[PDB]
Amino acid sequence: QTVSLFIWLPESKQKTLFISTKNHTQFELNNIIFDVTLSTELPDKEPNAIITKRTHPVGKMADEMRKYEKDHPKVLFLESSAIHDMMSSREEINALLIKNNIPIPNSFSVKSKEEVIQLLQSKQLILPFIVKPENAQGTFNAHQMKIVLEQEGIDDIHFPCLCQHYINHNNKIVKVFCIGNTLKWQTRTSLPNVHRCGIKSVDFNNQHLEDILSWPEGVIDKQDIIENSANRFGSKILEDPILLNLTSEAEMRDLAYKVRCALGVQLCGIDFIKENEQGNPLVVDVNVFPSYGGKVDFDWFVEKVALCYTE
Ligand SMILES: O=P(O)(O)O[C@@H]1[C@@H](O)[C@H](OP(=O)(O)O)[C@@H](OP(=O)(O)O)[C@@H](O)[C@H]1OP(=O)(O)O
Numbered sequence: 001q002t003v004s005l006f007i008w009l010p011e012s013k014q015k016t017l018f019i020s021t022k023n024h025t026q027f028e029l030n031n032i033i034f035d036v037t038l039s040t041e042l043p044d045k046e047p048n049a050i051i052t053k054r055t056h057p058v059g060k061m062a063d064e065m066r067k068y069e070k071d072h073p074k075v076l077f078l079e080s081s082a083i084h085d086m087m088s089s090r091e092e093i094n095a096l097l098i099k100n101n102i103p104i105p106n107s108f109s110v111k112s113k114e115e116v117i118q119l120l121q122s123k124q125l126i127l128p129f130i131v132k133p134e135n136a137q138g139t140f141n142a143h144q145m146k147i148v149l150e151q152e153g154i155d156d157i158h159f160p161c162l163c164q165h166y167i168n169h170n171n172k173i174v175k176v177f178c179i180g181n182t183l184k185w186q187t188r189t190s191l192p193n194v195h196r197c198g199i200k201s202v203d204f205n206n207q208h209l210e211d212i213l214s215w216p217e218g219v220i221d222k223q224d225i226i227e228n229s230a231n232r233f234g235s236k237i238l239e240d241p242i243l244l245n246l247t248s249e250a251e252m253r254d255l256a257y258k259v260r261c262a263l264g265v266q267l268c269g270i271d272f273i274k275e276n277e278q279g280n281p282l283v284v285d286v287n288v289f290p291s292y293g294g295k296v297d298f299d300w301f302v303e304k305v306a307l308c309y310t311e
């Protein structure tokens with residue numbers, strides 16, 4: 001049997017994702033011949049599956065994608081407009097995680113300051129909390145965060161947004177990347193433990209972690225400033241999370257399967273932290289079709305996508 005897989009990615013994504021690329025490749029896996037094509041443009045001829053990350057929620061690619069899906073219903077998408085749309089909403093992601101009993105830090109999707117005030121006053125939302133935009137993917141603004149340390153720190157929040165209790169997790173985050181059942185994982189630095197010293201809020205963009213160098217004195221312990229300032233608080237690779245005793249392979253596989261089932265996604269990245277590095281994994285982010293650690297092997301990627309397709 002033959003299966004055609006078509007990888008539809010802009011050059012920008014191709015460059016961040018792959019060490020190198022091939023326009024066309026053919027291989028056998030589990031008694032099936034796979035023909036794989038890579039292009040920046042949609043296929044002229046209908047494949048069995050299109051493998052794609054939509055670059056931005058709105059624009060030409062989004063429009064082309066929806067039209068193509070409607071007009072070619074037999075083509076499997078990894079991943080579809082509907083999946084990208086859901087994963088562009090922090091509300092929708094977290095609602096599905098909650099519905100499927102996947103631990104997260106306590107989270108509230110809010111549309112206004114009055115709502116935040118009511119959650120604080122009723123002791124549902126506990127300080128400190130991180131404020132994440134409702135829009136989750138494809139813009140600089142999607143990654144613009146505020147940590148609210150005191151009630152007064154709510155004044156400049158951008159709505160709508162997710163308010164999520166801030167967990168002191170000792171500045172380690174576990175990243176689990178999935179191509180279906182195939183996983184790759186790592187530990188990175190994250191954010192420092194924070195202190196409620198009187199400062200009302202601080203801000204950072206997750207793409208510009210050097211913002212943290214400008215936080216007022218007292219929010220971060222002086223030793224944490226010493227340990228992280230040389231790297232400008234950048235997201236740095238650490239030792240393997242199993243070797244660090246942060247998690248186990250079985251835990252990561254279980255969690256990843258649960259998340260994939262909850263969200264109906266095959267190509268994703270899951271971020272989790274642990275309070276004081278102990279206890280349940282707390283999922284803080286799920287991303288569609290991530291970078292897989294960046295600069296991955298093209299042949300590896302396509303074989304694992306084919307395996308996923310068969311399953
Ligand atoms: O692969 P990563 O390390 O999880 O980082 C991704 C990645 O940078 C991705 O961009 P792209 O490589 O798919 O173009 C980001 O998506 P957007 O820029 O479209 O929003 C993700 O936000 C990153 O996720 P994170 O930094 O949480 O790891």
Ligand SMILES: Nc1ncnc2c1ncn2[C@@H]1O[C@H](COP(=O)(O)OP(=O)(O)O)[C@@H](O)[C@H]1O
Nearest residue numbers: 105130142143164165166167190191206284285
């Ligand atoms: N509830 C939380 N408590 C503490 N730190 C958090 C929490 N949620 C996220 N973070 C930190 O903030 C960073 C950005 O949050 P994340 O949800 O991953 O946003 P993005 O989707 O922009 O990557 C994470 O990498 C982690 O360091």
Ligand SMILES: [Mg+2]
Nearest residue numbers: 206271284285
């Ligand atoms: Mg993240």
Ligand SMILES: [Mg+2]
Nearest residue numbers: 136285286287
């Ligand atoms: Mg994200």
